[PDB]
Each structure stands twice: as C-alpha cells, then as structure tokens.
Amino acid sequence: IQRTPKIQVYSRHPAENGKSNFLNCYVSGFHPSDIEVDLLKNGERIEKVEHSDLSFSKDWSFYLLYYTEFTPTEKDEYACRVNHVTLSQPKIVKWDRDM
Amino acid sequence: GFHSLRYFYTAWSRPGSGEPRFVAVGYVDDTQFVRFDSDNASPRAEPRAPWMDLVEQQDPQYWDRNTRNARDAAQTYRVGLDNVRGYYNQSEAGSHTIQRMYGCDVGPHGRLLRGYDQLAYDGADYIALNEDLRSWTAADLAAQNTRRKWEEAGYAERDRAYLEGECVEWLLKHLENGRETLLRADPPKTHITHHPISDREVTLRCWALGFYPEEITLTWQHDGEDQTQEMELVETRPDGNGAFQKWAALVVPSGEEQRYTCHVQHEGLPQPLTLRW
C-alpha cells in the first residue's frame, strides 16, 4: 500500500526580508519511507540542510521536516524538490511567503 | 486531562543498498524526546528534548538500558522482515517495511487509560494487541502466523506488564522532568492576511502560529454562517521549534471582507478568538 507525499513550503517566522528565519519543507502522508527532499535557492540545491527523525501518523504514513537557516530577500526564489517512489517526476513547490 | 507516552519503530529492507534500517523515536504528548538510528556506527539512543539532559542523574543506566533495547529491537525486526516476506513469498528484490506504535495513555488519576501495541506491514494494519491486553487481532492469513508464535511465546503478557507498569511510571517521570515543555499550552498567535486575486475577488487567510499542543480548530464565518466547505484548510505543520502552525483561507468578494470572521479554539486560549479584517 503506497501513498504520495504532501508538501508544504513555509518559514518558521513570517518573512521579514533581510531578517534571519528558517525555511521549512514538511512532507507528510507518504509511504514507503525512503524520500528525496532538497531545498533550492534559485534552482540550486542548498547544502547545509537538516531534517527531523522519521516518525509517522495514525494511518502509518510518514512525515519529516526539512529545514535550513536562511534570510529572505525580495528577489531570491526558494523551493522544495521532492522525489518518491510514487512520483514519476519530482514535485518542485515554490516557497510563497503568504502560505 | 490526559497524557501519553509512545514509541514509534520503523524497520525496512533496502535490497541492494545494504542491510535493513531501523529507526525508532519516542514521544510524550506531541513532542519527541528520544531517537535511535541503526545506520550509526555504534548506534545509541539519544536525547531529543532539553529536559532529557537531567535524565541520567535520576537514572544514568537509562541510556545503556535503552541502547541495549533499541539494538535488540533492531535485530528482532530485521528477522521479522524476513519471516513476513517469507509468509507472503515476496521477491527479495522489493523493499518492505514493518512499523510499530506502542505506548500508554494516562489520565488525571495518574493511572493508565489505554495501552496499545500495533504493527503495520507495508503501511497496512498487520497485527495489534487487543484492548484486553491478552489476545491479538491478525489482519490476514500471514499475520495468524505472527499471532501464533506470539501467543506461544507469551508476548501479550509481556506487553500488558510493561504497559501497566513501566510505561505509566516513565510517562509520569517525563511529565515531571519536562514540566515546562510538556505541561504548557501555548495559545496560537493569530492574525489575518489579505491577498487580492482580481479586482472582484480577494483571498482572506487566517493564521495560527506557534501553538502547542497540535489539536486546534479554525473556521471562517460569513455573517455567522459557517464556511467549512468553501474554505481551504492546510494540514497542521510543525514550526521546527517544538510548536505548530495552521491556516484557513477562503475567497471573498472585493468589498465584503468586513462580513467574514475567523474563529480559533485551542487549549491555551482562555476564550475562543474571533478575528476580523
């Protein structure tokens, strides 16, 4: 029984340009657990990215949080690239500071 | 009120890429406090909550006693993966997963309320401890095998004894040592934002930030008329600092923003909030 990841890209604190924040990509509801998650700054992977320990929900589906320390600007584009066995193509979700 | 100590185990094969991996985590209520990852060189259980730093002085043996258990668990589920796949006669080339979710709920009485021990295989229910803490409910033919060996090995009784003693005792210790983190209810920081779609439609988004515990309700009301099906509600999500966030949004006509209200309920709130743009 397999399940496609849900994705939410967002920040720990409301985006104040030039202030330091955290960029979060939260993937939930997937199965099996092996997942490929990257944070992108202008199409380029960010190296120093950490993530929480693997757990799962009442319906056995897994969730992880990926996060990196960042400082939003007016112009920099950020995203989250996710691949999974269930995804024939990677999903790339753009950061939006409003959701 | 009630609280819960839980343990989540994940074990899965990686055909080709090496031996099976076993990751276990533990939670009190809605916050992790320990972890164990079999892919470490000499893997040990580790603290994942600041209040766990003072666990050694109440009982230093904690970390060794735990590490030994995690290592053994790790072995038990490696062997399990092989027997279960064998029951099904599945090709060794496919990855497969065994899960586990056991713990206890205790209440204002400081006595148990529910114990549980449940297993999934490839993400579906496989076998679970019945609420009587003595029989097992097997999901399919292959899980009868697991049940029979577990019946004969007396594992239900091993579970009941743990769930009704050690589990309760430790859930109470943790609540005591984690009293600042664990016995709080941080109400959400709420506000509303405003994003114009066109000149005749505008998106209202109602934000709940930095709250704990996870359980929360957010709704929109149009002149006191609930708007649940008309609204977009995101899954609750962690902020990375031990709290949670959530929003609800809905599109309203570009002059009737004033006629909508967001309603917020949460354990930390003395009364439920009503917000308006």
Author numbering:
A (entry chain B): 1 to 99
B (entry chain A): 1 to 277
From the paper:
Major histocompatibility complex (MHC) class I molecules (MHC I) present antigen peptides to the surface of antigen presenting cells (APCs) to active T cells through interaction with T-cell receptors (TCRs), which play pivotal roles in antiviral defense. In this study, we screened bat MHC I Ptal-N*01:01–binding peptides from different bat-borne viruses (HeV, EBOV, MERS-CoV, and H17N10) and determined the structures of bat MHC class I complexed with these viral peptides.
In the structure of the Ptal-N*01:01/MERS-CoV-S3 complex, the conformation of the P3–P8 residues of the peptide could not be determined due to their poor electron densities, revealing a flexible conformation in the middle region of this MERS-CoV-S3 peptide. However, the other three residues (P1-Asp, P2-Phe, and PΩ-Pro) with electron densities available adopt similar conformations as in the other five structurally determined peptides. As a 9-mer peptide, MERS-CoV-S3 possesses a Glu at P6, corresponding to the P6-Asn in 9-mer HeV2, which is the secondary anchor residue.
